[PDB]
Amino acid sequence: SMNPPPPETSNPNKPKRQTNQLQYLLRVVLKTLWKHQFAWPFQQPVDAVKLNLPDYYKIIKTPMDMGTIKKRLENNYYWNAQECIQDFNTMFTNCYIYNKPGDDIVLMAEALEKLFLQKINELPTEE
Ligand SMILES: CN1CCC(c2ccc(Nc3ncc(C(F)(F)F)c(Nc4ccc(Cl)c(NS(=O)(=O)C(C)(C)C)c4)n3)cc2F)CC1
């Protein structure tokens, strides 16, 4: 049971912007989560072949990971901050959907999400 192609990270015909909020999402939100001791399972698409999880992409239809988010931010892929915030939230929700409560991977996601929520609470107002 195979891996799908990764999420899109470049699209020239997609309208996009650089805003102070999106800069914050990269320089603060992404960075802070990326350096966390629990970040590594989330830093790239799940290789569900290597992990022997043949059902993974049969259940998780909208996968998202921080490697993809990082690329999108570095590529100025997004139109607004909420588009990027949705990607983070999809990543967390997918984790809680696929896994059992209390699993180590869920604890890792919860630690990242707690930080994510704190940084989003301090999202600067649009300039
Ligand atoms: C018996 N045995 C048990 C574990 C094993 C297993 C079970 C469930 C997942 N589910 C998952 N869900 C979401 C993600 C994420 F991408 F959102 F982060 C994700 N990533 C990811 C990446 C690398 C590793 Cl090595 C891991 N392993 S791990 O056990 O979870 C960890 C990090 C060492 C605690 C996880 N993995 C992955 C698995 F391997 C199956 C067979």
UniProtKB/Swiss-Prot annotation:
Q: Where is the Bromo domain?
A: 17-123
Q: Indicate the impact reported for residue 99 to A.
A: Abolishes binding to acetylated histones
| Cross-link Glycyl lysine isopeptide (Lys-Gly) (interchain with G-Cter in SUMO2) residue location(s) | 58
* Superkingdom assignment: Eukaryota
Q: Where in the cell is it found?
A: Nucleus; Chromosome
Known tissue expression: Ubiquitously expressed.
Site feature: Acetylated histone binding = 99
Q: What is known of its domains?
A: The NET domain mediates interaction with a number of chromatin proteins involved in transcription regulation (NSD3, JMJD6, CHD4, GLTSCR1 and ATAD5). The C-terminal (CTD) region mediates interaction and recruitment of CDK9 and CCNT1 subunits of the P-TEFb complex. It is also required for maintenance of higher-order chromatin structure.
Q: Which disease is it linked to?
A: Cornelia de Lange syndrome 6: A form of Cornelia de Lange syndrome, a clinically heterogeneous developmental disorder associated with malformations affecting multiple systems. It is characterized by facial dysmorphisms, abnormal hands and feet, growth delay, cognitive retardation, hirsutism, gastroesophageal dysfunction and cardiac, ophthalmologic and genitourinary anomalies. CDLS6 inheritance is autosomal dominant. A chromosomal aberration involving BRD4 is found in a rare, aggressive, and lethal carcinoma arising in midline organs of young people. Translocation t(15;19)(q14;p13) with NUTM1 which produces a BRD4-NUTM1 fusion protein.
User: What does the annotation say about its assembly with partners?
Assistant: Interacts with p53/TP53; the interaction is direct. Interacts (via CTD region) with CDK9 and CCNT1, acting as an associated component of P-TEFb complex. Interacts with RELA (when acetylated at 'Lys-310'). Interacts (via NET domain) with NSD3, CHD4, BICRA and ATAD5. The interaction with BICRA bridges BRD4 to the GBAF complex. Interacts (via NET domain) with JMJD6 (via JmjC and N-terminal domains); the interaction is stronger in presence of ssRNA and recruits JMJD6 on distal enhancers. Interacts with NSD3. Interacts with NIPBL.
Q: What does this protein do?
A: Chromatin reader protein that recognizes and binds acetylated histones and plays a key role in transmission of epigenetic memory across cell divisions and transcription regulation. Remains associated with acetylated chromatin throughout the entire cell cycle and provides epigenetic memory for postmitotic G1 gene transcription by preserving acetylated chromatin status and maintaining high-order chromatin structure. During interphase, plays a key role in regulating the transcription of signal-inducible genes by associating with the P-TEFb complex and recruiting it to promoters.
Q: Anything else of interest in the record? A: JQ1, a thieno-triazolo-1,4-diazepine derivative, and I-BET, a benzodiazepine derivative, have been tested on tumors with success. Treatment with GSK1210151A (I-BET151, a I-BET derivative) has strong effets on mixed lineage leukemia and promotes myeloid differentiation and leukemia stem-cell depletion.
Q: What is this protein called?
A: Bromodomain-containing protein 4
The organism of origin for this protein: Homo sapiens (Human)
Per UniProt, what is the name of the gene that codes for the protein in this document? BRD4
